[PDB]
Amino acid sequence: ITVTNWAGNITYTAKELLRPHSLDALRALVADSARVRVLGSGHSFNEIAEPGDGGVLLSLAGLPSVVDVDTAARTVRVGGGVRYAELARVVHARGLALPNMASLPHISVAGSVATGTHGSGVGNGSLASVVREVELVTADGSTVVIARGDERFGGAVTSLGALGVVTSLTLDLEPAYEMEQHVFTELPLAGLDPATFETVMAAAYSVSLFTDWRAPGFRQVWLKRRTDRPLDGFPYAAPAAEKMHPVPGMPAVNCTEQFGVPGPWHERLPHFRAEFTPSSGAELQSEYLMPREHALAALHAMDAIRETLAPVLQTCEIRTVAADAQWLSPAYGRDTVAAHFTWVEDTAAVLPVVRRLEEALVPFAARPHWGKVFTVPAGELRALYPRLADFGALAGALDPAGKFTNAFVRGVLA
Numbered sequence: 001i002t003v004t005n006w007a008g009n010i011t012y013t014a015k016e017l018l019r020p021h022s023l024d025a026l027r028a029l030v031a032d033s034a035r036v037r038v039l040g041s042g043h044s045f046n047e048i049a050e051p052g053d054g055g056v057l058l059s060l061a062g063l064p065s066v067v068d069v070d071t072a073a074r075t076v077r078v079g080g081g082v083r084y085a086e087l088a089r090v091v092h093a094r095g096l097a098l099p100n101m102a103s104l105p106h107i108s109v110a111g112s113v114a115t116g117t118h119g120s121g122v123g124n125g126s127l128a129s130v131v132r133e134v135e136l137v138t139a140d141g142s143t144v145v146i147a148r149g150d151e152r153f154g155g156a157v158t159s160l161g162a163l164g165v166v167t168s169l170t171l172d173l174e175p176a177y178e179m180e181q182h183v184f185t186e187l188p189l190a191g192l193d194p195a196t197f198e199t200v201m202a203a204a205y206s207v208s209l210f211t212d213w214r215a216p217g218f219r220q221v222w223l224k225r226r227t228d229r230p231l232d233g234f235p236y237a238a239p240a241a242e243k244m245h246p247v248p249g250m251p252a253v254n255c256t257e258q259f260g261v262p263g264p265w266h267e268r269l270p271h272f273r274a275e276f277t278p279s280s281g282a283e284l285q286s287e288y289l290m291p292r293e294h295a296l297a298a299l300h301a302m303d304a305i306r307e308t309l310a311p312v313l314q315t316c317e318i319r320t321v322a323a324d325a326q327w328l329s330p331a332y333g334r335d336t337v338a339a340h341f342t343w344v345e346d347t348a349a350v351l352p353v354v355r356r357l358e359e360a361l362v363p364f365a366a367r368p369h370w371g372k373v374f375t376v377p378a379g380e381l382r383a384l385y386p387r388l389a390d391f392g393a394l395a396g397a398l399d400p401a402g403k404f405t406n407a408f409v410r411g412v413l414a
């Protein structure tokens with residue numbers, strides 16, 4: 001069989017996707033394989049999941065999708081291969097909630113936290129940030145549990161799958177909450193000064209800007225507001241008259257409910273409703289995560305090259321992330337602005353533009369999203385992460401032979 005990622009721009013070398021049906025099978029398979037990479041739901045856009053020729057590509061799809069809510073402790077134990085859509089549905093039905101979700105819920109929890117996946121909100125950490133414990137099947141088949149408080153915990157959650165197979169994760173939860181989603185159109189870049197930009201991004205619990213980099217300024221602003229919090233007037237852009245899709249010209253029916261209609265957290269945090277279940281997408285993605293104080297300068301750098309960006313762009317999404325404790329989180333150690341690009345699926349045309357964008361963002365210490373397309377050289381990458389050395393030492397300790405290190409990870413650490 002031919003295995004690809006979700007977008008289909010990456011075809012893996014493996015002629016079979018190993019899907020052990022028991023933990024006993026899994027441990028034995030790992031112990032007996034020379035090199036392993038796990039495939040989650042394939043929502044990466046590069047060779048991060050590629051095991052190389054003769055490497056084993058393994059999935060947790062054949063294992064039970066455990067979602068075990070502890071309502072007294074407000075925690076949930078989840079299989080690595082569980083996706084957020086089922087996780088959310090389950091914890092919500094128990095009166096509890098996550099503090100954030102990605103744009104689309106049909107992604108593996110283990111895969112998501114492995115690369116620094118995040119939503120938006122100035123006080124909201126990455127998805128990895130609620131993880132209090134990870135259970136790993138290590139290179140020899142044995143289980144290692146690492147929990148918050150361990151000196152190694154900082155490299156254990158966002159690990160690029162390079163420590164071993166995450167078989168379970170435990171996550172902290174809060175009481176279930178309701179949210180409204182208010183959409184606005186045409187937020188000008190002109191006059192968007194440091195103070196106004198801060199106001200706009202803090203205007204609701206989670207806020208995204210979208211643009212096509214065509215007409216100056218921003219096409220859409222999405223305020224995802226918690227109904228248990230104040231919402232002030234938003235004078236900066238016009239309220240949307242119709243239901244919007246972040247990509248101009250795409251079906252708004254796919255999207256979560258707008259016009260300020262209250263609904264549960266897990267039906268408002270994603271941009272796409274649970275019913276929207278694409279088996280592939282005709283897109284590429286890149287994303288660059290920078291110190292939040294550089295947001296306006298970075299936005300102005302994009303604006304000044306927007307004729308270059310636009311022709312290969314579906315939409316650009318601007319978000320915020322609170323500083324991450326995970327050593328390889330692109331949000332590590334600093335409050336962060338994120339600039340994401342959903343490109344047309346045309347690798348040959350997009351790569352030149354990616355290199356050009358990267359050159360423009362270089363002075364802003366832009367860290368690329370590990371799951372997305374980037375061309376930043378390995379040496380520059382290492383210079384961007386203060387605690388990368390400590391990650392490398394943790395991987396060496398837990399995986400001395402580099403069973404879980406592929407070409408992608410090797411380049412990173414080199």
Ligand SMILES: *Cc1cc2c(cc1C)nc1c(=O)[nH]c(=O)nc-1n2C[C@H](O)[C@H](O)[C@H](O)COP(=O)(O)OP(=O)(O)OC[C@H]1O[C@@H](n2cnc3c(N)ncnc32)[C@H](O)[C@@H]1O
Binds near residue numbers: 102107113161
């Ligand atoms: C396709 C897509 C991606 C996406 C998104 C929306 C869509 C439709 N929305 C995002 C968002 O709102 N915010 C954000 O920061 N990122 C967003 N993305 C990207 C996506 O979340 C990430 O690329 C994510 O890492 C993808 O996870 P997935 O599980 O789908 O991808 P994978 O290629 O198969 O795996 C990613 C890495 O994780 C390792 N992995 C997977 N499972 C395990 C286990 N159980 N144990 C150890 N490692 C694991 C893989 O080996 C690979 O390194």
Ligand SMILES: OC[C@@H](O)[C@@H](O)[C@H](O)[C@H](O)CO
Binds near residue numbers: 103271
């Ligand atoms: O990080 C991924 C998100 O930016 C992405 O899924 C967008 O929200 C989407 O492409 C908008 O249509």
